[PDB]
Amino acid sequence: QCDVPPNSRFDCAPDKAITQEQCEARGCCYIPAKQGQPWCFFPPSYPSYKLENLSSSEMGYTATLTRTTPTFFPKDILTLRLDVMMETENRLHFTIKDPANRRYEVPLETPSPLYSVEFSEEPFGVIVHRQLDGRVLLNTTVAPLFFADQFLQLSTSLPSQYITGLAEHLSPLMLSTSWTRITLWNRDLAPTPGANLYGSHPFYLALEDGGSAHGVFLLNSNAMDVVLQPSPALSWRSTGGILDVYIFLGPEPKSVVQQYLDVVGYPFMPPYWGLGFHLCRWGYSSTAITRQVVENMTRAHFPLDVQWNDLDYMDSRRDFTFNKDGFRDFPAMVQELHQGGRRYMMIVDPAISSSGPAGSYRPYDEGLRRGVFITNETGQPLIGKVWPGSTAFPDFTNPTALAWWEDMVAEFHDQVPFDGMWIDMNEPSNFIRGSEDGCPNNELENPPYVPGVVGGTLQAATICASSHQFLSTHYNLHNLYGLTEAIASHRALVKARGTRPFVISRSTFAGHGRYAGHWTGDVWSSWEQLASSVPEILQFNLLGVPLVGADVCGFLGNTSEELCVRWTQLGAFYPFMRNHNSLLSLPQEPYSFSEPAQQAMRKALTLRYALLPHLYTLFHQAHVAGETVARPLFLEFPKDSSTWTVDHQLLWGEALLITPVLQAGKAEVTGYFPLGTWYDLQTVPIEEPAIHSEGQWVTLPAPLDTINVHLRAGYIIPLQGPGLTTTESRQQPMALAVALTKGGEARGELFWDDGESLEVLERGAYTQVIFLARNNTIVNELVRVTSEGAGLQLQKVTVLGVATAPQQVLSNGVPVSNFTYSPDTKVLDICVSLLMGEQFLVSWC
Ligand SMILES: *[C@@H]1O[C@H](CO)[C@@H](O[C@@H]2O[C@H](CO)[C@@H](O[C@@H]3O[C@H](CO)[C@@H](O)[C@H](O[C@H]4O[C@H](CO)[C@@H](O)[C@H](O)[C@@H]4O)[C@@H]3O)[C@H](O)[C@H]2NC(C)=O)[C@H](O)[C@H]1NC(C)=O
Ligand SMILES: *[C@@H]1O[C@H](CO)[C@@H](O[C@@H]2O[C@H](CO)[C@@H](O[C@@H]3O[C@H](CO)[C@@H](O)[C@H](O)[C@@H]3O)[C@H](O)[C@H]2NC(C)=O)[C@H](O)[C@H]1NC(C)=O
Ligand SMILES: *[C@@H]1O[C@H](CO[C@@H]2O[C@@H](C)[C@@H](O)[C@@H](O)[C@@H]2O)[C@@H](O[C@@H]2O[C@H](CO)[C@@H](O)[C@H](O)[C@H]2NC(C)=O)[C@H](O)[C@H]1NC(C)=O
Ligand SMILES: *[C@@H]1O[C@H](CO[C@@H]2O[C@@H](C)[C@@H](O)[C@@H](O)[C@@H]2O)[C@@H](O[C@@H]2O[C@H](CO)[C@@H](O)[C@H](O)[C@H]2NC(C)=O)[C@H](O)[C@H]1NC(C)=O
Ligand SMILES: *[C@@H]1O[C@H](CO)[C@@H](O[C@@H]2O[C@H](CO)[C@@H](O)[C@H](O)[C@H]2NC(C)=O)[C@H](O)[C@H]1NC(C)=O
Ligand SMILES: [Cl-]
Ligand SMILES: [Cl-]
Ligand SMILES: [Cl-]
Ligand SMILES: [Cl-]
Ligand SMILES: [Cl-]
Ligand SMILES: [Cl-]
Ligand SMILES: [Cl-]
Ligand SMILES: [Cl-]
Numbered sequence: 036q037c038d039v040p041p042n043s044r045f046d047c048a049p050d051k052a053i054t055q056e057q058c059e060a061r062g063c064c065y066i067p068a069k070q071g072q073p074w075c076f077f078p079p080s081y082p083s084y085k086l087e088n089l090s091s092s093e094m095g096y097t098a099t100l101t102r103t104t105p106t107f108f109p110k111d112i113l114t115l116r117l118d119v120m121m122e123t124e125n126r127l128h129f130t131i132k133d134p135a136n137r138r139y140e141v142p143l144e145t146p147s148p149l150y151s152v153e154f155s156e157e158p159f160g161v162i163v164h165r166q167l168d169g170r171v172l173l174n175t176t177v178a179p180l181f182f183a184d185q186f187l188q189l190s191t192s193l194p195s196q197y198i199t200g201l202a203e204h205l206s207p208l209m210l211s212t213s214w215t216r217i218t219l220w221n222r223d224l225a226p227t228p229g230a231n232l233y234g235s236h237p238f239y240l241a242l243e244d245g246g247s248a249h250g251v252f253l254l255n256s257n258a259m260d261v262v263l264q265p266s267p268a269l270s271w272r273s274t275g276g277i278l279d280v281y282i283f284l285g286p287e288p289k290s291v292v293q294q295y296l297d298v299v300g301y302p303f304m305p306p307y308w309g310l311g312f313h314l315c316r317w318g319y320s321s322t323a324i325t326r327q328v329v330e331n332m333t334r335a336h337f338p339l340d341v342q343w344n345d346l347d348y349m350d351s352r353r354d355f356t357f358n359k360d361g362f363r364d365f366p367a368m369v370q371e372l373h374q375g376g377r378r379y380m381m382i383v384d385p386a387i388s389s390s391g392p393a394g395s396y397r398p399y400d401e402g403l404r405r406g407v408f409i410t411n412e413t414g415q416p417l418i419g420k421v422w423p424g425s426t427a428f429p430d431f432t433n434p435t436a437l438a439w440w441e442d443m444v445a446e447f448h449d450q451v452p453f454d455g456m457w458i459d460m461n462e463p464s465n466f467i468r469g470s471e472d473g474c475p476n477n478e479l480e481n482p483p484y485v486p487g488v489v490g491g492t493l494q495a496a497t498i499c500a501s502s503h504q505f506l507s508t509h510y511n512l513h514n515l516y517g518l519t520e521a522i523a524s525h526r527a528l529v530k531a532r533g534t535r536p537f538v539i540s541r542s543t544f545a546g547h548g549r550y551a552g553h554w555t556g557d558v559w560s561s562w563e564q565l566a567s568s569v570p571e572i573l574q575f576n577l578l579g580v581p582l583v584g585a586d587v588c589g590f591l592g593n594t595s596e597e598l599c600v601r602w603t604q605l606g607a608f609y610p611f612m613r614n615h616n617s618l619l620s621l622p623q624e625p626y627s628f629s630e631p632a633q634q635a636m637r638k639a640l641t642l643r644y645a646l647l648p649h650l651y652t653l654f655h656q657a658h659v660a661g662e663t664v665a666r667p668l669f670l671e672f673p674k675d676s677s678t679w680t681v682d683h684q685l686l687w688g689e690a691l692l693i694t695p696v697l698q699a700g701k702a703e704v705t706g707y708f709p710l711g712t713w714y715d716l717q718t719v720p721i722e723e724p725a726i727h728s729e730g731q732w733v734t735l736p737a738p739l740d741t742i743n744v745h746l747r748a749g750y751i752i753p754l755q756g757p758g759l760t761t762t763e764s765r766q767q768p769m770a771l772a773v774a775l776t777k778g779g780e781a782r783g784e785l786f787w788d789d790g791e792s793l794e795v796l797e798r799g800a801y802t803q804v805i806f807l808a809r810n811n812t813i814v815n816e817l818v819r820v821t822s823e824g825a826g827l828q829l830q831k832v833t834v835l836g837v838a839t840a841p842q843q844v845l846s847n848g849v850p851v852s853n854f855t856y857s858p859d860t861k862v863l864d865i866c867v868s869l870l871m872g873e874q875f876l877v878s879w880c
Pocket of ligand 12: 695697701
């Protein structure tokens with residue numbers, strides 16, 4: 036009975052240190068490890084639930100689950116209901132609930148399948164096969180089902196050692212299965228390994244031998260541990276709610292992500308300007324200093340779309356105010372930014388100063404009157420401590436709080452016309468434990484199982500777990516705090532401005548990308564954090580939050596010039612690109628460095644700006660089809676298993692491979708090149724030529740002034756001319772880069788709209804064009820053409836992989852004004868006067 040191989044031992048004492056005698060008295064097996072792996076573990080006979088009265092419906096299956104012998108946790112729910120819903124050919128959904136009591140559930144809006152589902156009777160389990168090859172994807176029979184009031188555990192075998200997801204943590208893209216405990220409890224902590232960080236996303240994607248994959252989402256917002264072991268297998272261990280489980284069949288990893296996003300929401304479409312460069316620090320302490328940033332960037336020809344402020348603008352660090360010393364003329368500063376074609380962003384905190392004289396601070400006084408705050412045992416506002424001092428915490432599950440937040444945002448916007456909201460401290464972060472008045476002693480504050488959270492308590496760095504919100508207690512709702520503020524702020528900005536919102540949030544939960552973007556928080560200015568930003572940006576793209584990045588050059592500490600060059604090079608490929616800096620750090624704006632470093636930084640921004648029409652098209656694909664913007668090599672080439680562990684390179688979309696230097700003192704880099712021809716993007720004019728790979732590692736020159744970017748053969752990228760803002764760049768002529776296959780084929784596309792309006796796709800207010808290269812011709816195909824796309828000038832076409840110099844180049848049947856061909860690089864560069872919205876044919880021979 037206790038002959039269980041070491042890797043398949045499931046922990047029977049997750050709750051406390053246990054002796055052999057106590058272990059055996061639990062009905063469990065005791066075998067010390069020989070050097071983590073639990074010593075006390077479940078025999079195959081350990082009491083679980085039994086399946087009874089299974090029946091079938093058009094929808095799927097239902098059954099009763101009964102437990103006869105209590106577990107060692109209090110308040111087992113002995114009778115449960117199983118509902119299995121076979122929702123689409125790719126999505127299976129099951130719930131396990133208490134039929135006798137409504138339990139907390141996360142608020143979320145709603146030929147043969149690829150899966151089959153079977154059941155084990157005793158012990159109970161759910162078994163999910165992939166129909167095509169019979170691979171077992173889920174098998175929950177591997178360990179007991181626990182379902183007690185404050186402890187749910189469900190386990191499964193995994194199909195391979197390769198699993199990604201379960202944000203937010205500082206780790207490789209692929210998670211370690213060597214007895215790893217991953218804790219989801221939103222927490223204000225500077226990113227560091229092994230810790231629960233700012234967000235929680237209870238989703239994983241698991242790879243399968245041969246390159247197929249599936250995904251599993253547990254729709255549960257309670258504090259939870261996910262435990263991975265090397266058999267391989269996984270256990271979800273949550274502290275409340277129900278088991279609400281989705282399985283996404285893929286089979287392609289890209290399809291798994293899209294299917295997940297079909298449930299939680301497709302990413303929101305940002306405004307075009309939001310893809311420009313953003314620049315911020317804590318310490319721009321007046322409007323005069325802040326204006327100097329734009330002046331100094333402009334003088335040195337650095338693009339900058341959006342100027343930001345941190346807390347500096349506020350009156351005594353309070354939301355919806357501005358001080359009358361350094362920021363006396365705040366409204367005029369922001370108006371002037373707009374006059375120059377730029378946008379403005381500033382920090383907003385959730386917590387509202389509660390200490391001012393009554394009647395002197397409207398956000399608090401109104402919030403009090405309307406009952407918008409989270410309250411404590413006696414029904415008064417829970418008071419904690421954040422930047423302004425004593426603060427109350429809005430309850431963004433309360434519809435009245437939603438209205439109050441809309442009003443506060445609209446009123447402040449009437450004074451100062453900011454263009455979005457940077458929402459910070461929304462875990463919610465508390466500088467003291469729980470509240471000024473501590474927390475009561477109850478089961479929510481002191482639960483029977485505490486997940487592996489930093490500080491060993493749910494109260495640490497946050498508010499009391501038993502505090503009251505409109506929908507439920509904070510215990511159940513904590514991991515949604517940031518998300519609910521993001522929803523509230525999205526709506527507030529729609530109402531205040533009437534154009535697309537731009538929200539960047541620290542704390543997140545699954546589905547966040549439907550409303551907002553994210554940055555990775557208070558990362559150190561170190562080579563280590565530069566490198567760790569690549570897997571983290573990739574993770575968030577898999578989780579449907581493509582508008583993500585890290586603070587360029589790092590936030591905490593002092594950057595070095597070399598680090599800031601490399602970070603700016605890589606960071607130009609973050610889908611959200613902002614350089615932000617702490618109060619006590621040395622300056623790190625691009626213009627603050629030496630001339631050579633400035634040149635490298637300028638080149639990085641210039642290239643990003645040239646690529647914006649393409650980056651924006653990629654965001655449109657994310658928004659309409661659940662695609663990723665930045666993606667790991669394995670998403671694009673899953674059938675090449677050498678890609679599975681690669682997380683220090685990234686793709687933009689299908690075709691642009693970025694291979695950054697991530698260490699000090701390097702003048703070369705070694706990166707993986709999937710099967711195909713990869714053209715060096717440096718061979719395209721912007722204002723070894725080709726890697727022929729069999730699927731292999733390649734060492735590339737990478738001096739300080741260089742980042743390696745390659746374009747995949749078969750693809751066409753739209754580009755646009757330069758500007759210091761998107762207001763300027765959007766008016767410039769466009770260009771194509773056309774990467775030919777050996778056989779002469781390529782394809783690409785452009786999506787174009789006005790860059791900020793709401794409901795564009797619903798109203799058809801956009802242009803969509805496909806580009807095709809074939810048989811020594813390049814044409815466009817006009818999927819949709821509207822006024823918004825009209826008048827886009829195409830002035831340059833660059834063709835890569837042209838083997839022989841042409842004797843003639845034609846544009847709509849007329850020999851072109853001029854072209855150049857480089858026999859060394861195989862590049863044909865063609866000057867044209869064409870329109871993206873009008874059918875054209877370019878040819879050469
Ligand atoms: C729920 O939240 C509310 C706030 O919304 C919270 O109210 C707070 O209650 C405490 C007392 O429980 C108040 O603290 C008092 O403040 C007064 C005046 O400043 C003092 O005179 C009081 O001193 C007493 O306690 C001292 C101990 O250090 C003794 O030495 C002294 O002799 C007094 O007996 C005391 O500090 C606090 O001011 C309010 N907060 C606000 C903003 O009004 C309430 O406690 C919360 N409820 C629960 C159950 O947590
Ligand atoms: C899902 O996982 C469960 C649990 O791991 C698997 O069920 C278990 O399968 C093993 C091996 O097939 C069984 O062990 C064997 O039992 C036979 C019969 O007595 C014995 O002769 C062998 O020595 C061996 O011990 C075990 O009985 C069985 N457990 C249960 C509860 O049924 C199951 O195979 C997995 N399902 C799939 C489709 O992979
Ligand atoms: C499993 O179901 C049986 C039978 O329930 C009957 O028909 C079902 C389709 C549904 O319509 C039920 O309402 C029915 O009762 C349960 O056994 C019955 O239990 C009731 C109440 O305890 C009793 O009066 C009947 O005599 C029982 N009938 C039989 C044939 O035994 C049984 O309790 C269910 N098991 C579990 C664990 O819930
Ligand atoms: C980041 O650097 C600041 C400033 O460092 C100073 O200026 C540099 C150009 C260089 O010449 C340094 O050696 C200088 O010390 C640090 O703040 C300083 O800290 C030191 C030591 O604690 C103190 O004596 C200075 O007075 C501080 N100066 C200022 C302007 O604050 C800061 O410590 C550095 N941060 C980290 C994490 O190392
Ligand atoms: C913008 O650039 C100006 C000019 O370089 C900076 O002003 C100088 O700052 C240095 C400090 O390093 C002083 O010693 C000089 O006296 C200043 N020169 C002038 C002409 O004022 C300014 O600090 C920069 N501002 C920002 C916000 O980066
Ligand atoms: Cl012992
Ligand atoms: Cl016990
Ligand atoms: Cl509830
Ligand atoms: Cl399949
Ligand atoms: Cl700081
Ligand atoms: Cl890698
Ligand atoms: Cl490197
Ligand atoms: Cl022409």
